[PDB]
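Q: Predict the assembly, please.
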Amino acid sequence: MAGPLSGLRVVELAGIGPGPHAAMILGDLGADVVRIDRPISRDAMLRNRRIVTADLKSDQGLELALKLIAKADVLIEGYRPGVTERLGLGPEECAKVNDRLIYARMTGWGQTGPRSQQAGHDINYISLNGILHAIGRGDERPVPPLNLVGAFGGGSMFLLVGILAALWERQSSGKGQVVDAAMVDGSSVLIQMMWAMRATGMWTDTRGANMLDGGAPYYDTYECADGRYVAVGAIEPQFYAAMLAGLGLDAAELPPQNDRARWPELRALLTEAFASHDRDHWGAVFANSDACVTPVLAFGEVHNEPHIIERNTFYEANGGWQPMPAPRFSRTASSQPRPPAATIDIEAVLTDWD
Amino acid sequence: MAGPLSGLRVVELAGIGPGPHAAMILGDLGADVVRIDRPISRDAMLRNRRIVTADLKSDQGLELALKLIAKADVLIEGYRPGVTERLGLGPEECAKVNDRLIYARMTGWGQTGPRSQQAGHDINYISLNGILHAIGRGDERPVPPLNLVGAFGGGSMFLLVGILAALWERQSSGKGQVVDAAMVDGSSVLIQMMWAMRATGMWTDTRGANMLDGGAPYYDTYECADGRYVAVGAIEPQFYAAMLAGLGLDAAELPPQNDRARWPELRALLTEAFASHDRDHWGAVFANSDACVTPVLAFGEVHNEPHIIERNTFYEANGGWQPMPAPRFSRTASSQPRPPAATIDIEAVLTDWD
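A: Predicted assembly structure:
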């Protein structure tokens, strides 16, 4: 199995959202992941694993799971706190058979505290820590940024960081430990720059009125003649200048870039410029310069974009595209993911594991 | 220094956005991070660092930087590709002094390809891979989800994963390597769930008309009588039933939860219910339930929320609050971050590092 985590053994207790995503990325980087599900997937996310079946509520399944866990470097579970405990698969039980295990617990609210037994989803976790409130236009209610911020950015990615950091600690202690990755916590650290900025006057709690939330005319999308969009990210003065040039606007005729009192006027002039031609026209004008202007591609258009083609950011699968592994490693590169295959018998994995 | 990465040595070449975020989290987790800037910060992101200065364009500075790098496990750089090369700090030159070094390159477009030399920001990177198009209400142009998706979720967090993955690899190969972390790639893996779902009809390219983007009435925010908001994430039927129960809506008088043709009617009925009382009302109603109904807190209110208090998700620093380290480790816990301190002498760090 190619990639830097070749040799790592992972047991994933089947769930939804951040747990399978973390398992996926360990698999993409070369780990040997075995997912235990209840008694061929069409779900590209279940790439790079073996799937086995056991009833964990039964003496036989629990015993088979414990044998797998005994041989594993990492366990991923994403149930409510207390669930693995009552199944016989809690950290203290696993430590009995394997004190080198990294026991990685992926929740929204965390292992403890007043909400920790309450159901939730991404939207809920980013609602409680200020994030959701900060997303969207000022004249509308907050819009969810899909489940990119709680489940993945602040969820699976922090579980991964915790797993891989604990493996580093294990090299000198000779032991594992439990990683408590809560989406409410990871997402907060993900947005740490905004928490920094609020202490210095560089971020307000006022929605849709900041440098990076669409409040700034030079950091936003604009609708083009064809009803399609471009994105403008020209924060630096020189990038801003290149953008005005591409639009054919004379800077002398415009308000200063950071005259906030005249931002409505600047936005209006930029709106009128972009509206005067179709997205593809601006994509060509701005293809090479430092103007920080890009066409806003829909998913179905991405695979035709030159920078996307040349770097092989995606590969074909199941009639559609899936992203290749990231990040990229110069010496122990990952390969193209292996599709979800047929279930295997669990005793065969146990056999293979030495 | 407390946490799982105690003992790791990181050199960060001072930059903006994802590179310092990555260095911060390594420091948070106990790493010994030394940031080289140009010749006391009030930026909380520069927590858990020693800051030194060197002119990398001068013979003397190049030499001091190489001596630091010779003692390090990790180098983080976020310049345009080619920049460290021309300075004499490129991967090949570092390898001559330290072939164990994990050389972590944090860019938007990646090391190679047609855009690799072009300026950009977060909004640009997520515009070319389908992400930005997917964010926002269907009747408005796309809205940037701050810089959480490109810079951090699909940026620093992939850099971190690659650093820690390559450290794992080194434990068996004895050697380091280069990590090419491109925000355009990392963000695409971040959103894999959507790429998977597109192939099975579980996600469409139509904006604002899916399960997780505000298209679904049970997965969205709602404005309350006070003009503040709740978030509803009640996907599963039993959570949805609990949400109806709290509102006191009779399900027999409503459209079925997943009759999409009647989602306008469902939304309007939910809108009228949540608008009838203030946000804090709904916190009382839904207490201890699985309704997936939470208050949408502004940043300035977060520190008063009981679940946030009880778990010490934040700590007080400088102006306001800053997020504590995440994720959390049972045996080698991180401690409260060290503030930015005065610049120190680079020869002093070398003496420290030997």
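The domain at 219-307 of chain B is CATH 3.30.1540.10 (formyl-coa transferase, domain 3). Chain B touches chain A through 149 residues (CB under 8 Å).
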